[PDB]
Amino acid sequence: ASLIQRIARQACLTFRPAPGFPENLSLLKSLLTQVRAEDLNIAPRKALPQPLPRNLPPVTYMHIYETEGFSLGVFLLKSGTCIPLHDHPGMHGMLKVLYGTVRISCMDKLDTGAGHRRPPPEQQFEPPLQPLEREAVRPGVLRSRAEYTEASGPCVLTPHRDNLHQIDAVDGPAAFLDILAPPYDPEDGRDCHYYRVVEPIRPACDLPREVWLLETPQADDFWCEGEPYPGPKVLP
Ligand SMILES: [Cl-]
Ligand SMILES: [Fe+2]
Ligand SMILES: [Mg+2]
């Protein structure tokens, strides 16, 4: 069986904390470490002649397989693009770079269910906050920023750690195979929401670093469309 098919089988077994989950997650990570662009029939892509249409998607998605337990697919970023900061509520995540370089910034929202965690009213922000914006801004933590190439191992996130991240293409196009479990499902309250860091105007700090996060629609210059998957087909 192809590698992508064995990834799907192991993912199905891994995602259905149950007994044996940590060992299964380890086996899945080992399989993803092995994945190469050619295993998916994808050739690495270089920058397009940048007289590019404004209707051209900055990012595209190849669907491979999705169940109630997990989703498996490939995101392909054009030059100079990014998948902006977003969350994966109650989800595990695991991705492997296929070509190019991406910068992955990892953050977490602090739990604010108990209330009263708005910024100090006297604190001011770069592009000042609208009243509705300030009412919604909540604290978070910037945990890491790192560059990943096809030689790097998988980048992994859990429901409770590194659950927010941004993925920027560095010095050219890039692509990664992504596994999410459970998949996004608005019907179950698992929305793919976007966030923007707001910078306070009060005259640096090492990571981990306190940040202020605001839920927002994705940036105007970002959207993702599907394109055909050319690799080995995955079956049940
Ligand atoms: Cl490009
Ligand atoms: Fe993500
Ligand atoms: Mg190679």
SS3 string, 127-168, reads: CCCCHHHHHHCEEEEEEEEEEECCCCCCEEECCCCCCEEEEE
Beta pairing partners, 142: 107, 209
Whole-number Å distance, alpha carbon 20 to ligand 3 midpoint, is 32
Instruction: Look at domain 3-226 and name its CATH class.
Output: mainly beta
For the CA of 53, the nearest ligand = 1
Ligand 2 geometric centre to CA of 79 (Å): 18
Cα of 36 from ligand 3 centre, angstroms: 6
What is the Å distance from ligand 3's center to 119 Cα? 48
Residue 165 assigned ligand-binding role: yes
79-83's contacts with Cβ under 8 Å and 24+ in sequence apart are: 79/47, 79/48, 79/50, 79/169, 79/172, 79/173, 80/169, 81/168, 81/169, 81/222, 82/166, 82/167, 82/168, 82/169, 82/222, 83/59, 83/166, 83/167, 83/222, 83/224
Which method, experimentally, gave rise to this model?
X-ray
In DSSP terms, which residues pair with 145 in a beta bridge? Answer: 105
Question: How many of the other CB atoms lie within 10 Å of CB of 146?
Answer: 11
Number of other CB atoms surrounding residue 5 within 10 Å: 16
Q: Resolution of this entry in Å?
A: 1.9
* Closest by Cα among 26, 25, 30 to 14: 25
Residue with the two structure tokens 């098919």: 5
Instruction: Spell out the domain ranges in the chain.
Output: 3-226
Contacts of 9-14 with C-beta under 8 Å, sequence gap 24+, read: 11/69, 11/70, 11/72, 11/179, 11/181, 12/67, 12/69, 12/70, 14/70, 14/181
Tell whether residue 86 is among the known ligand binding residues: yes
In whole angstroms, what is the distance from residue 119 CA to residue 137 CA?
Answer: 7
DSSP the chain: --HHHHHHHHHHHH----TTHHHHHHHHHHHHHT--GGGGTPPP--PPPS---TTS-SEEEEEEEE-SS-EEEEEEEPTT-EEEEE--TT-EEEEEEEEEEEEEEEEEEPP-TT---SPPTT--BSS---HHHHHH-EEEEEEEEEEE-TTS--EEE-SSSS-EEEEEEEEEEEEEEEEEESPPBGGGTB---EEEEE-B----PPSSEEEEEEEEPPPTT--EEE----SPPP--
User: Does 92 appear as a known binding residue?
Assistant: no
Ligand 2 centroid–CA 14 distance in Å is 19
Assigned token pair, 216: 């927002």
Distances (CA, A) of 126 to 108, 163, 194, 199: 21, 25, 19, 6
Q: How far is the CA of 202 from the centre of ligand 2 (A)?
A: 31
**Strand pairing partners for 147?**
103
Cβ contact 71:11 at 8 Å: no
- Residue whose token pair is 């309250």: 189
Ligand with an atom nearest the CA of residue 163: 2
